[PDB]
Amino acid sequence: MRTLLDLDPKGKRVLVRVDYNVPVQDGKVQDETRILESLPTLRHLLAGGASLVLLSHLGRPKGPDPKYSLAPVGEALRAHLPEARFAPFPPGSEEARREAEALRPGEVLLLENVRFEPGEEKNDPELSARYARLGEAFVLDAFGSAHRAHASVVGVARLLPAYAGFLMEKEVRALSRLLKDPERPYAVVLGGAKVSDKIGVIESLLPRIDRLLIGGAMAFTFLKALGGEVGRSLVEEDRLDLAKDLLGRAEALGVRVYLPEDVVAAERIEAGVETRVFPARAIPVPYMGLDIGPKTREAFARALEGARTVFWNGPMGVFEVPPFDEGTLAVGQAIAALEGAFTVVGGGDSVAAVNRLGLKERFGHVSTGGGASLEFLEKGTLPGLEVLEG
């Protein structure tokens, strides 16, 4: 993969696809972490004598939705880079082109949300050709956008010499340690409500790991297939055979699997609702398992002892509804407490859990909040990565 130093930025206007998809409220960025993380790439290019045009998505609006304008992000960026300016013009527009052509060495221009362009998500080749007028070289520094063939990710990269920025490279390398020669014992903790959403990553990682811990509602599909009585717990009836086959593959590959022993159940998903603890294989109707129980949390933590690599993605229960978030928080706490293990966390709820444990710095790598990381682990590559090779 072509990396940042392969580009000679001197006297060139460089187009950079960054990830500034940050939380915004009342016209103010609520967390500028993503903006800060993009700085090394920008500083390198500016020190190299280039001018910069920045492109980013914000939310997933289908067109020019003012709620998702990058204006607030431009303000936050300028506070760190005084030479940066924001222009409220879609990147495929003639106004954007003129603004970009007027830039001088050292200047930085952030254009409007790429999602405002109708051809962006369609990877419109003509739109990509217009993006190609914005710079002489292209730097992709947004791993979280690399899983989709979009005009500002793949399309323009095919018209300009393309390179991976510092951040993009860092993310790819971290996840690559979960695919190539990972340190063993290697344990994987997967959660989520449906096994169907984990089939790809499970089949991809099974031949590479030693232990697989399964939590979340998807565990009930496995448990029912194995003969357990899960009461009114969520189950994908059309995936019962598949669940059993995945366990069969684990047995064939020498991967030890762990499933819940007990669960915290309730008659309905309600915050603070009264609960009952039942064996995961004996949940009486009308109860439904909503989180892994205390014995399961303990067992899952013990299963990680000795691991040198741990990858975790997914909630252990109904994370957004207390007290059914305890299992997820407990797994995060257990992983943070490990010694001698490279730990990687991905997934919406699990990353959210890590962010409120007050132990985030304890993890080896917390992947980009999105689906790109999981797709990369399943396929071994991404569209945005392929345009940086060759």
As annotated, the active-site residues are: 34, 194, 348, 371
Q: Give me the least distance between CB of 346 and Na ion, in Å please.
A: 15
- Is residue 327 within 8 A of residue 273, CB to CB? The reply is no
Does residue number 381 form part of the binding site for Na ion (CB under 5 A)? no
Q: Which stretch binds Na ion (CB under 5 A): 8-16, 143-151, 203-211, 275-283?
A: 203-211
Within positions 11 to 70, which residues make up the interface with Na ion, using CB under 5 A? none
Q: Which stretch binds Na ion (CB under 5 A): 117-125, 207-215, 273-281, 374-382?
A: 374-382
Q: Is the Cβ of residue 3 or residue 204 nearer to Na ion in the bound state?
A: 204
Q: Give me the least distance between CB of 208 and Na ion, in Å please.
A: 9
Residues in the chain: 390
Q: Which stretch binds Na ion (CB under 5 A): 34-42, 275-283, 315-323, 373-381?
A: 373-381
Q: Measured between alpha carbons, how far is residue 44 from residues 13, 81, 105, 171, 216 in Å?
A: 13, 13, 13, 18, 43
Q: Is the Cβ of residue 2 or residue 379 nearer to Na ion in the bound state?
A: 379
Q: Measured between alpha carbons, how far is residue 142 from residues 18, 39, 259, 262 in Å?
A: 5, 12, 35, 40
Annotated binding-site residues for substrate read 19-21, 34, 57-60, 115, 148
Q: Which stretch binds Na ion (CB under 5 A): 148-156, 196-204, 280-288, 313-321?
A: 196-204
Q: Give me the least distance between CB of 219 and Na ion, in Å please.
A: 23
Q: Which residue is nearest to Na ion (CB)?
A: 204
Q: Is the Cβ of residue 62 or residue 180 nearer to Na ion in the bound state?
A: 180
- What is the Cα–Cα distance from 250 to 100, expressed in whole angstroms? 54
Q: Is the Cβ of residue 201 or residue 351 nearer to Na ion in the bound state?
A: 201
Q: Give me the least distance between CB of 380 and Na ion, in Å please.
A: 5
- What is the Cα–Cα distance from 96 to 94, expressed in whole angstroms? 5
Q: Is the Cβ of residue 104 or residue 180 nearer to Na ion in the bound state?
A: 180
- What is the Cα–Cα distance from 218 to 351, expressed in whole angstroms? 19
- Can you list the alpha helix ranges (DSSP code H) found in the chain? 33-47, 71-80, 94-101, 125-131, 166-176, 199-205, 219-225, 240-253, 294-303, 326-336, 348-355, 372-379, 383-386
Annotated binding-site residues for ATP read 198, 289, 320, 347-350
- What is the Cα–Cα distance from 270 to 157, expressed in whole angstroms? 48
Q: Give me the least distance between CB of 262 and Na ion, in Å please.
A: 33
Q: Give me the least distance between CB of 244 and Na ion, in Å please.
A: 21
Does 23 sit behind a cis peptide bond, omega within 30 degrees of 0 on the bond before it?
A: no
Please state whether beta strands 13-17 and 28-29 pair in parallel, antiparallel, or not at all (unpaired).
Answer: unpaired
Does residue number 204 form part of the binding site for Na ion (CB under 5 A)? yes
Give the x-and-dash track for 153-192 against Na ion (CB under 5 A). ----------------------------------------
Annotated binding-site residues read 19-21, 34, 57-60, 115, 148, 198, 289, 320, 347-350
Q: Is the Cβ of residue 179 or residue 321 nearer to Na ion in the bound state?
A: 179
Q: Measured between alpha carbons, how far is residue 76 from residues 29, 73, 245 in Å?
A: 7, 5, 50
Q: Which residue, among 183, 252, 259, has the nearest Cα to 214 in the 3D structure?
A: 259
Provide DSSP, 161-190. -EEE-HHHHHHHHHHHTTTSS--SSEEEEE
Point out which residues bind Na ion (CB under 5 A): 204, 380
